[PDB]
Design a protein around this ligand. Structure first.
Ligand SMILES: *[C@@H]1O[C@H](CO)[C@@H](O[C@@H]2O[C@H](CO)[C@@H](O[C@@H]3O[C@H](CO)[C@@H](O)[C@H](O)[C@@H]3O)[C@H](O)[C@H]2NC(C)=O)[C@H](O)[C@H]1NC(C)=O
Ligand SMILES: *[C@@H]1O[C@H](CO)[C@@H](O[C@@H]2O[C@H](CO)[C@@H](O)[C@H](O)[C@H]2NC(C)=O)[C@H](O)[C@H]1NC(C)=O
Ligand SMILES: *[C@@H]1O[C@H](CO)[C@@H](O)[C@H](O)[C@H]1NC(C)=O
Lengths: 118, 132, 118
């Protein structure tokens, strides 16, 4: 599950969240979306069908889906998710890793050293 | 810390640089740049005595520190021509933040000698002002 | 950095020594303050004898310092050497916390006593 592009978060109108499921052996897989912990009606997002992924040796399949949601809700920090359901999984469970949130380092040094310059 | 680009003594700023041929990814390497500022905590704004209080704001423009305007000599064909080296040196006039060890700084003070007054001259940096 | 002298100096107890340091002969450098200081550990670089008239308590009666402006040199004499005077020292000009110095190393060895059958 991928973070939005930066340039769509500069006009501050709408943002896009893309859920990619890749590399599974049977060609039948569901994708459901949910806001926080409540789901959405399926007329609010777009999901594709599955295709034969190009691969060396053995065959896989992939599927994609997206969602356009309001920019200020993502700027607030509401959580979105993705539920990929499958028959060859333990319980067909989810993944919810997107929110709105550089590396700084602050040090204090005594440095009564041997002999140095600045 | 290998090659000196700027050694300025009106503002007391020094810039060096070095190509650090780093260990990992041995066909690419970084360019490091070191800058050193020494800030005096007891100097005035103009260098005279009663000017204004002690300076509390210090501004450094690296486009001015790296400037080069003294004419140079260039051998083009079989000739010596003189050229400039910068686009911006339309003019001292710069303000200095520190002193310099190799220059005098004096002042003038009027004192009384019974009758009239004089124009007594006073050394502000006593090491550099001997007549020699 | 323009300052130069003898890098290593050896003697034995009871003997004297004479150290010479060199500087550029510009008129600031002739009238400024000259110093001999012992760069110990724990931060400081305490002065032992200076050009303005300072002589320390440990160097009383033993040392002096003479400035020759036309050579651009200045000499330090130290008499009645001991084994506690082994360490790292510095010539210099001006203020100690700047770097117009030069490092000197001095080692004093124990002399002969009660083995003189050769
Ligand atoms: C920083 O301070 C210095 C020192 O005060 C300023 O320079 C001095 O400015 C005064 C007034 O402009 C000059 O006095 C003039 O003297 C002549 C005689 O030589 C007389 O004809 C004028 O009527 C006036 O009395 C003085 O010469 C001048 N220079 C010195 C003392 O070397 C300077 O202007 C100040 N700079 C800034 C940016 O504030
Ligand atoms: C420049 O250094 C020389 C050392 O080579 C000085 O010469 C000695 O000066 C002392 C005076 O303190 C005399 O007692 C010595 O006889 C001189 N010669 C030697 C070989 O030591 C010289 O004095 C210095 N220059 C000036 C102008 O004093
Ligand atoms: C003082 O300096 C003179 C140089 O004129 C020197 O001969 C003498 O040995 C010095 N005194 C000492 C080291 O006590």
């Amino acid at each position: 599950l991928l973070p939005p592009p930066s340039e769509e978060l500069a006009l501050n109108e709408l943002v896009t969240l893309t859920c990619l499921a890749r590399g599974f052996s049977p060609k039948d897989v569901l994708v459901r979306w949910l806001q926080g912990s409540q789901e959405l009606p399926r007329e609010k997002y777009l999901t594709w069908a599955s295709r034969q992924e190009p691969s060396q040796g053995t065959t896989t399949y992939a599927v994609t889906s997206i969602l356009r949601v309001a920019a200020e809700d993502w700027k607030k920090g509401e959580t979105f998710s993705c539920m990929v359901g499958h028959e060859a999984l333990p319980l067909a469970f989810t993944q919810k890793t997107i929110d709105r949130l550089t590396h700084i380092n602050v040090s204090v040094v005594m440095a009564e050293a041997d002999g140095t310059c600045y | 810390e290998r090659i000196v680009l700027v050694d300025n003594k009106c503002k007391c700023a020094r810039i060096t640089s070095r190509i650090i041929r780093s260990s990992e990814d041995p066909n690419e390497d970084i360019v490091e740049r070191n800058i050193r500022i020494i800030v005096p905590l007891n100097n005035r704004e103009n260098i005279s005595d009663p000017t204004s209080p002690l300076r509390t704001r210090f501004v450094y423009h690296l486009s001015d520190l790296c400037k080069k305007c003294d004419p140079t000599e260039v051998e083009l064909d079989n000739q010596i021509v003189t050229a400039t080296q910068s686009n911006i040196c339309d003019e001292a006039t710069e303000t200095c933040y520190t002193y310099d060890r190799n220059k005098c700084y004096t002042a003038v003070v009027p004192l009384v000698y019974g009758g009239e007054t004089k124009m007594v001259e006073t050394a502000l940096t006593p090491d550099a002002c001997y007549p020699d | 950095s323009p300052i130069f002298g003898p890098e290593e100096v050896n003697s034995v107890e009871g003997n004297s020594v004479s150290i010479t340091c060199y500087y550029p002969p510009t008129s600031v450098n002739r009238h400024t303050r000259k110093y001999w200081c012992r760069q110990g550990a724990r931060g400081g670089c305490i002065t032992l004898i200076s050009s303005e008239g300072y002589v320390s308590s440990k160097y009383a009666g033993r040392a002096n310092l003479t400035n020759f402006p036309e050579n651009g040199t200045f000499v330090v004499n130290i008499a009645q050497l001991s084994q506690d005077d082994s360490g790292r020292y510095k010539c210099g000009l001006g203020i100690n916390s700047r770097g117009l110095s030069f490092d000197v190393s001095l080692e004093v060895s124990q002399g002969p006593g009660l083995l003189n059958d050769t």
